[PDB]
Structure 1
Amino acid sequence: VPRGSHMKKLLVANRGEIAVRVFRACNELGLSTVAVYAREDEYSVHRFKADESYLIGQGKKPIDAYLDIDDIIRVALESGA
């Protein structure tokens, strides 16, 4: 078992139905949640289902925003996920 496996907060590095599916599971497990969203996806339901959410991939095309490894990690660390 890796060190640091205890969890209070989880971030989904995704969008759409699968992100909402994960948030639901998190909430039922007493975990708080974090969404990321591209600018063009700002009305996505998953953005509003999380306890907090953050824009990512500023100035990139929308698919590249969701593939932006370092910006996703940045959000995870900043939010305390």
Structure 2
Amino acid sequence: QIKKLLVANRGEIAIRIFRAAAELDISTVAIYSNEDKSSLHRYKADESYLVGSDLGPAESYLNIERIIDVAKQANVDAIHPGYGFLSENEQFAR
């Protein structure tokens, strides 16, 4: 019952998720930071948005409120956290 999916991660894991979701005929959404302006995972998805234009490139991926702001403004009904960022974060799921 999922129309489109967002990946709250970057790099190899994101690309793995986009490939899985596109196989399930589900639209894909990717986020990036200031220093990942040209990371591979930015291009392998259907939709790509910049998170935290003001916040640093390290903190950008770990900003619970701003990642939700992107998902909301894109009709995203499912987010895959990946691993080693907000994957073990409780208040992100809530």
When the two structures are superposed, what TM-score results if normalisation uses the length of structure 1? Answer: 0.90
Look up the SS of the partner of 1:14 in the other structure. coil
Alignment equivalent of 2:6, drawn from 6, 11, 15: 11
Alpha-carbon deviations, 1:15-58, whole Å to 9, x = none? 00000000000000000000000021010110000100100011
Identity of aligned residues (%): 58
Q: What aligned pairs does 1:1-81 form with structure 2 within 5 A after superposition?
A: 6-81=1-76
- Give the count of matched residue pairs: 76
Distance 2:19 2:71 in 1: 19
Query: Gapped runs of 5+ residues in structure 1?
Result: 1-5
- The structure showing larger relative contact order (alpha-carbon pairs under 8 Å, at least 6 residues apart) is 2
Distance 1:71 1:63 in 2: 14
More helix by share: 1
When the two structures are superposed, what TM-score results if normalisation uses the length of structure 2? Answer: 0.78
Distance 1:57 1:14 in 2: 14
Runs of 4+ in structure 1 off by over 3 angstroms are none
Aligned Cα root-mean-square deviation (Å) = 0.7
* Aligned-pair CA distance for 1:67: 0.3
